Write a protein that binds this DNA or RNA. Structure first.
Ligand SMILES: [Cl-]
Ligand SMILES: [Cl-]
Ligand SMILES: [Cl-]
Ligand SMILES: [Cl-]
Ligand SMILES: [Mn+2]
Ligand SMILES: [Mn+2]
Ligand SMILES: [Mn+2]
Ligand SMILES: [Mn+2]
Ligand SMILES: [Mn+2]
Ligand SMILES: [Mn+2]
Ligand SMILES: [Mn+2]
Ligand SMILES: [Mn+2]
Lengths: 107, 85, 98, 93, 92, 105, 96, 78
DNA sequence: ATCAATATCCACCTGCAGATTCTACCAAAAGTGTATTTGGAAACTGCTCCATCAAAAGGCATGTTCAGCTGAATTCAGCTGAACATGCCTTTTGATGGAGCAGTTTCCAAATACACTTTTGGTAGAATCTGCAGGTGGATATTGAT
DNA sequence: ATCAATATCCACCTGCAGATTCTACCAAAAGTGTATTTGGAAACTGCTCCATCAAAAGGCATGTTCAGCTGAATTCAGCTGAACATGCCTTTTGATGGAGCAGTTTCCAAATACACTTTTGGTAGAATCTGCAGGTGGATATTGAT
């Protein structure tokens, strides 16, 4: 009886089984379907991939090997849809975007 | 051992610190009355958050405010904080 | 005549400096004393996780920076460059804080 | 004393998208916060969806609808594509 | 068979204003208000019990949720009324 | 027989509140006193808003409370206005309020 | 012939419409607009009457609140006339 | 064309109820713009609910859920 | 400012259509009685982590001087937006008729749940590996006097 | 238009605090078998909603006149930014000691489960009576001579 993981069967990195247990015990519904954990894990993995891509690119712009919170803030705020999705979120140690109102510049 | 009673600590939010905060917010010039005003709003904000955090602490029958209590208090007030869970 | 920058140059330079960095701008220990004093006014002999105070400080500074951005927009709207308490009041009223 | 997090999966995705990039402790904490937040948003909207329609089961359909409700447009289409592909590969394989 | 709070709202109205009525649309707004507050309190109590690894929502979770959700004086009155009702229920 | 709402000295339905707690996916279990507490709080808030709205209806020569009276009762009460600060009352209108600088001098 | 001064009738309209609660946009154009916008998201939709009514109540309440904030932004800059910049400032501060 | 059904007098009545005494001539078009955005954001979500219920009729409840999910809870239609 | 003329709004009133309240039937929800299980609190510890203070070095807060430039105050006209009269067309109101969608019941395959058993991926801690902070030095861009 | 003064930016470099990899145990996921729920399709029904037509009322589009508001221009006193000396208190790292959080066991009050009875809340039509057109008269506010 050979063991394969659901994350392998869905071609995913995120843990399908853990997401299933977390749905099954979070008092979300009486029952949970077989494909809901796969779908949710895939969506979470995709969003993680997008933010990691843009933050790593920001880290490479700064000649840095490790992503730090500042790179995540730069990736989030400079992307329209990411900034929309996290419009009420605070990134600790992220700072803000460089932005000076034109009327404040010397005349 | 016990600390001396804490008093009037809102004055620790010094004018230079408020100036740095406004600078990060893009402010170039600050009226002299802003600082006390800022302290006022800050205290209100802090009060509300701590009030909710301590409430969670009391519901768990704990005597230690945890980072999770603060995170839940911020989330319920619409100010989700990342990085402390 | 010793060197003297004109009013606004150092302010703009500080804007650039602090908009590029992410360190906390309020001193750690005074903020901790303020947090503990307020909590003491809610419930006595409370202890604090070290990360709880840091979370409170990150949240407070982010909130104040955003409020100062909105206050700057309110000051500029009325054709001036100096933020006044009236700007903070307008921004807070529009945000829903009032 | 055994705490679970998403850190290893996030790191595997990071090695996918940037083989030569690392990540700091605090940035990993931020990423874990992000994953948990999005999980809660999607699961709560799916719960409410199933309840609105008197269905006792959260299925792939509720998750898809919640993703369409929660994400901005193009990001929503991309996430729907990846979720659908994962479910179809899961069923047949 | 559609469910609403209409009869209970009308009974409370007759308590507070014996000779005052209510329009259909105002009653609909009443029902919306009741459902909204119910959902707020129940959701906060759910999250409270979950944060503390409790599978049971008790009067304690409801009390804490009411303290979190309502403004101060209103919260104190609502806590008083909840406690009073629970004590009369226990003794009844 | 006797109903739980009668035993709790309440008008609001204790049994219905318990069923709605058990069916809303809130927790695996629901305690005996939670529906009583919740029903009492809901009845109290309803009583407050109905009292103030009936006073508004009687100021308006009216026998029946209409949405306008509920809006007036909510917005003129500070804590009710806080609790419903992002709530829209259909057909409620707004509070009469003209900025002083717009009034003639 | 009688002629009120500019602003008097405006104030009278402010009082009258802040005193009443009826909907201020004509129903038929709003209904056509709702159906057109919905068509761009999904085709061959029908609409419950209460759905259109609720959409209009929401839209008018939103616009009235936005006009309050816009008026506050216009007054902030020491004038009595709301301009597009006032609406833009109000929406930017609200989060829109 | 159809967005022009929101006539100048209606936008003026809306501003009057909001307390506005004097209105710039460009405001009307600006208002139409924001109204369209608002309506779009609401209707999209409403339609999504309609699609999840395998219905072809937008119900008042769909609109109520769309409004609540956007932080603008509406009373009186449930 | 008073005084007359004019327009608007509010409070009243009657007649009655329409909305609300009252009434009675019944399917479904709550209540009841009894049996059984179980979550979590109470008690007991074992350590993690927090409170508080200590030293010392230097980073930063504070007060002061002074002057540049900003906010505040004011003036004035052009041209924008308000107010109003007029005529028409869009919306409103009313009626009629079907198609089409929203609900509803039932029944069987399919999907999901759950207990038991087996396997392994995830974790904590130890060991290993490394980028980047924190220094120095030089080039370069900016700023302000002159 | 330069030139001195100052700040910013770049490139280098190394040690260690922080990040990553390694390791092995075990909780949790997977496999299996059985029990329980449910989705949905097939046939059926009755409201809703949309299509369509028609009259007419009132609200809108348009043009005209002008009052007054907004924007520009100007001027000035004082406030706020720049720079500096001074000294304190924050930061960093660690010690000490105990508070309180977390792991574990035991067992009862409280919750769930189930079969059956009693009560109730929803619904539609009848009965009740309030709120609304559409009128008047009086109060109030506005506007123009003076
Ligand atoms: Cl001010
Ligand atoms: Cl599924
Ligand atoms: Cl309870
Ligand atoms: Cl403008
Ligand atoms: Mn105190
Ligand atoms: Mn147990
Ligand atoms: Mn100026
Ligand atoms: Mn292994
Ligand atoms: Mn460096
Ligand atoms: Mn102890
Ligand atoms: Mn009955
Ligand atoms: Mn009338």
């Amino acid at each position: 009886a050979k063991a394969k993981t659901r994350s392998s069967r869905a071609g995913l990195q995120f843990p399908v089984g853990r997401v299933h247990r977390l749905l099954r015990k979070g008092n979300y519904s009486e029952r949970v379907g077989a494909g809901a954990p796969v779908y949710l894990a895939a969506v979470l993995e995709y969003l993680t991939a997008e933010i990691l891509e843009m933050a790593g690119n920001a880290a490479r712009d700064n000649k840095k090997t490790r992503i730090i919170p500042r790179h995540l803030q730069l990736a989030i705020r400079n992307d329209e849809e990411l900034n929309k999705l996290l419009g009420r979120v605070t990134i600790a140690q992220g700072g803000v975007l460089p932005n000076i109102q034109a009327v404040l510049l010397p005349k | 051992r016990h600390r001396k009673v804490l008093r009037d600590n809102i004055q620790g939010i010094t004018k230079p610190a408020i100036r740095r905060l406004a600078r990060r917010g893009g402010v170039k010039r600050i009226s002299g009355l802003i600082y006390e005003e800022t302290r006022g709003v800050l205290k209100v904000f802090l009060e509300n958050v701590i009030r909710d955090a301590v409430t969670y602490t009391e519901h768990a029958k704990r005597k230690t405010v945890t980072a999770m209590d603060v995170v839940y208090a911020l989330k319920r007030q619409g100010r989700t904080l990342y990085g402390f869970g | 005549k010793p060197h003297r920058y004109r009013p606004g140059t150092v302010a703009l330079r500080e804007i650039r400096r602090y908009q590029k960095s992410t360190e906390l701008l309020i001193r750690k220990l005074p903020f901790q004393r303020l947090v503990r004093e307020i909590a003491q006014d809610f419930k006595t002999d409370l202890r604090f996780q070290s990360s709880a105070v840091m979370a409170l400080q990150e949240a407070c500074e982010a909130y104040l920076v955003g409020l100062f951005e909105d206050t700057n927009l309110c000051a500029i709207h009325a054709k001036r460059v100096t933020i006044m308490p009236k700007d903070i009041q307008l921004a807070r009223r529009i945000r829903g804080e009032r | 004393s055994r705490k679970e997090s998403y850190s290893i999966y996030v790191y595997k995705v990071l090695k996918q998208v940037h083989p030569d990039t690392g990540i700091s402790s605090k940035a990993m904490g931020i990423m874990n916060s992000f994953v948990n937040d999005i999980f809660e948003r999607i699961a709560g909207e799916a719960s409410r969806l199933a309840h609105y329609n008197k269905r006792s089961t959260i299925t792939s359909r509720e998750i898809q609808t919640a993703v369409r409700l929660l994400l901005p447009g193009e990001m929503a289409k991309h996430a729907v594509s990846e979720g659908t592909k994962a479910v179809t590969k899961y069923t047949s394989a």
